[PDB]
Every structure is written in C-alpha cells, then in structure tokens.
Design an enzyme around this catalytic site. Structure first.
Site, short mmCIF file in Angstrom:
data_model
loop_
_atom_site.label_atom_id
_atom_site.label_comp_id
_atom_site.label_asym_id
_atom_site.label_seq_id
_atom_site.Cartn_x
_atom_site.Cartn_y
_atom_site.Cartn_z
N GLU A 215 -38.99 57.26 -23.61
CA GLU A 215 -38.02 58.11 -23.78
C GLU A 215 -37.31 58.80 -22.64
O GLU A 215 -36.33 59.34 -22.38
CB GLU A 215 -38.65 59.29 -24.53
N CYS B 296 -30.26 53.77 -0.98
CA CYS B 296 -30.93 52.87 -2.10
C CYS B 296 -31.22 51.63 -1.43
O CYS B 296 -30.54 50.85 -1.69
CB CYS B 296 -30.03 53.00 -3.45
N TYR C 49 -34.04 55.72 -32.00
CA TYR C 49 -34.96 55.14 -32.74
C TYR C 49 -35.50 56.10 -33.88
O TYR C 49 -36.26 55.87 -34.73
CB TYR C 49 -36.29 54.65 -31.95
N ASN C 50 -34.76 57.35 -33.91
CA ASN C 50 -34.89 58.41 -34.50
C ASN C 50 -36.54 58.82 -34.36
O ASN C 50 -36.98 59.29 -35.51
CB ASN C 50 -34.58 58.05 -36.03
N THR C 51 -36.81 58.88 -33.26
CA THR C 51 -38.21 59.30 -32.96
C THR C 51 -38.04 60.51 -31.88
O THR C 51 -36.85 60.49 -31.28
CB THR C 51 -38.90 58.41 -32.45
C1 LIG Z 1 -35.82 61.48 -27.15
C2 LIG Z 1 -34.43 60.97 -26.78
C3 LIG Z 1 -34.21 60.72 -25.21
C4 LIG Z 1 -34.49 59.58 -27.47
C5 LIG Z 1 -35.24 59.47 -28.92
N1 LIG Z 1 -36.44 58.88 -28.93
C6 LIG Z 1 -34.43 58.93 -29.79
O1 LIG Z 1 -34.73 57.78 -30.32
O2 LIG Z 1 -33.38 59.13 -30.44
#
Ligand SMILES: CC(C)C[C@H](N)C(=O)O
Length: 366
Positions: free
Chosen positions: A337, A60, A261-263
């Site tokens: 993500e 690296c 982020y619950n996404t």
């Molecule tokens: C897709 C995962 C790595 C994370 C998702 N974006 C979350 O907020 O939990």
C-alpha cells in the site's frame, strides 16, 4: 504480484517492485518499452541521454547509471558522458525546461517553447519535443519512485525499505464523507504549508522546489484546473503530435488513479476512493492546481501528517527520502500500500508537469 518474474533475477530492481501491482505494471511497461525500445522521433541514444539529464536533476544514480549503460550499448558517443558540454547544442537547449519540469513546472512559459522551436541548424520539431517532454517527466517521476521505495543498486533485496487502531479512525472519517466560500482559502492554506559525477549533466544544480532567494516557503501560483486539463486539452494535444504515446499515457494515468483492491490495511470491502483522491489532489495542490468542486479540508481529515511529509518529500525532494520517513507513516498499513501511494504520486506529479508544458505549447501555437 507477477511473482515468477520478480523472483527470477531477470528484470531489474525497479521492475521487481513495480510487479507488486500487476495492473499498473502493464501500463508502466508499455510506456517504458515505447520510450526506450521502440523507434520514434528521436534516436535510441538521444532518448537515453535525455533520460540521463532528467534523472540527474534529482541526483538519481540508479537511473543515471542505468541509462548511461544503455546509451553505450546502443551506440552513443562515449564522450557525451563526460558532461553536457560535449553534447549537441540541440540536446543542451533542453536544460532549462528539464530543470523547470522537475522542480517548478508552473514557471514553464511559451517563451521557453519558442527557444526550443527556434529555426536554426538543428531545430526541435513538435513531435521530437513532445517525445522529449514525455521522456523528461517520465524519468523525473521514476526518480520519485526509486527514492520513495528505496530501490537498491543492481551492484553488490531489491529495496532498502520494502522486502518482497487509527486505521479504524480513518475508515470512520471516510464513511462520514461518503454519506454527505472558504473553499478557495483552504486550498491556499494547504499549498503554502511547508514540510557529484551527475553534476556535469545539469545546469543550476541547487535549483529546486523551494526558492531560497526569497523569504517564506514555496507557494506556486494558483491554477484553475479546468483551464487546461488532461481529459479535455492535454491528451488531445499529445495524440496529435505523438499519437503512439498519448494513448499509453492516458491509460497509465487512469490505471493508477483507479487502482484499488478495496482493502484499507487489515480490512476488506472498503471503498477507498476518497483517500486516493486526496493523495492525488494534494500532490496537484503542491504544484498549484486547484479543483473547484473539491473541499481541500478533506486532505487534513484523511492524510496524517507523517504521510504528507513523505508524499511531499518524494514528489519535490526525492534525494531526501529516508527509511525512517518511510517507516514513520501508516505504521499499520501493508508495504504494498506504500508502493501504491508511490504510484499515485508519480502519476499525479507527471500529469501536473506535463500539463504545464502542454499548456505552454498551446499558448505558443496561438
Ligand atoms: C491504501 C490505498 C493506497 C490503497 C488501498 N489498498 C486500495 O486498495 O484501494
């Protein structure tokens, strides 16, 4: 993200990409500043040099070149940069466990610890050794991050890969799981599945995860996770031998494991903890660690094949990550993500390497 810092030009490329997740960045930075810019058991130049040895395991140059410059700015003897042979015998004794930590931590044994603590002219103390294990694993995990995120040199974007619906199938399969002796077999299946200037800072350059001196793919022995855990065993050992660093590590492990982020991609209001647990537990599986109450069938249900190839390449063979490989998985997910997956994986990898080394120290002390 920490947008004003990122786009300021005053921190390096690596920290810029870390800033994509402010709650992880804080934990990352605290440990980084502790290891490299705070007085401790080891002198500043020793710590940078130990980091050069660690980053060299994965070839690296981003990290080697960065610590080479700091080593010099902090008063390190320039002759050490001609290679390991010019460095103190005390630093050289670290080569074996550097190599094992990086590629095959499960092979770390109390006899390795014994050679390190051996009485002589310059002996490792336990606080010194623990700081060095933390340094070594930290830069191994950072080599994963640098390659996985395509972090570019500071010389003349911060990434060659970032640039600061099967989703619905995946979201459905997650809901099924939440609503609800082959279990030892499913682990074995998932674990056996197979997918130049820096040379003077290492011994045995071609040693890696895969053992080519034997036929068949690499399969580490199975370790029952409960026999030696971070929560119950490893954390407590480090806070006793290196107090100021164990708390910061524990905070970083939990910062990454619970980050959400619950996404899920374009979607919101989703609990993603089954998915993130599977990424974590897969990587630990790769290093031989088995959790009893986990169905390892969930890995294949949740992690698409291109994601497993990426995860396993970044954890075990980071030099070999490509833009195509980064692009090929999770085509409809956001870049952030992808960076998130990289955080989860460097933390899962580092905890595994650490725990094997910490278990070996415990066995030696008895
Ligand atoms: C897709 C995962 C790595 C994370 C998702 N974006 C979350 O907020 O939990």
């Amino acid at each position: 993200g920490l947008e004003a810092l990122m786009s300021s030009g005053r921190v390096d490329n690596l920290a810029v990409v870390m800033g994509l997740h402010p709650d992880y960045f804080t934990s990352f930075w605290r440990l980084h500043y502790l290891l490299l810019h705070t007085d401790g058991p080891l002198a500043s130049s020793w710590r940078h040099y130990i980091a050069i040895m660690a980053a060299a395991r994965h070839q690296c140059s981003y990290l080697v070149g960065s610590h080479m410059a700091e080593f010099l700015q902090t008063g390190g003897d320039p002759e050490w940069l001609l290679g390991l042979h010019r460095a103190p015998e005390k630093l050289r004794k670290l080569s074996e466990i550097n190599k094992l930590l990086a590629h095959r931590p499960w092979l770390i044994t109390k006899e390795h610890i014994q050679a390190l603590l051996k009485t002589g002219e310059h002996t490792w103390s336990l606080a010194e050794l623990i700081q060095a294990l933390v340094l070594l694993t930290h830069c191994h995990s950072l080599s994963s991050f640098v390659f996985g995120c395509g972090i570019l040199p500071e010389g003349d974007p911060p990434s060659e890969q970032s640039s600061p619906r099967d989703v619905e199938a995946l979201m459905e399969r997650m809901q099924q799981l939440q609503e609800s002796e082959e279990m030892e077999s499913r682990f074995e299946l998932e674990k056996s599945e197979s997918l130049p200037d820096m040379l003077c800072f290492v011994e045995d350059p071609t040693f890696g995860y895969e053992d080519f001196t034997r036929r068949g793919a690499q399969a580490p022995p199975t370790f029952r996770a409960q026999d030696y855990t971070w929560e119950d065993h490893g954390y407590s050992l480090i806070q006793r031998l290196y107090p100021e660093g164990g708390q910061l590590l524990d905070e970083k492990f939990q910062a990454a494991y619970s980050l959400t982020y619950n996404t899920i991609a374009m979607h919101s209001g989703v609990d993603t903890s089954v998915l993130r647990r599977a990424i974590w537990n897969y990587i630990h599986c790769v290093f031989g660690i088995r959790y009893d109450d986990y169905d390892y069938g969930e890995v294949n249900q949740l992690l698409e094949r291109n994601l497993k190839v990426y995860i396993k390449t970044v954890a075990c063979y980071p030099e070999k990550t490509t833009r195509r490989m980064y692009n090929l998985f999770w085509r409809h997910f956001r870049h952030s993500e992808k960076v998130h997956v990289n955080l989860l994986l460097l933390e899962a990898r580092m905890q595994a390497a650490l725990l094997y080394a910490l278990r070996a120290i415990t066995r030696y002390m008895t």
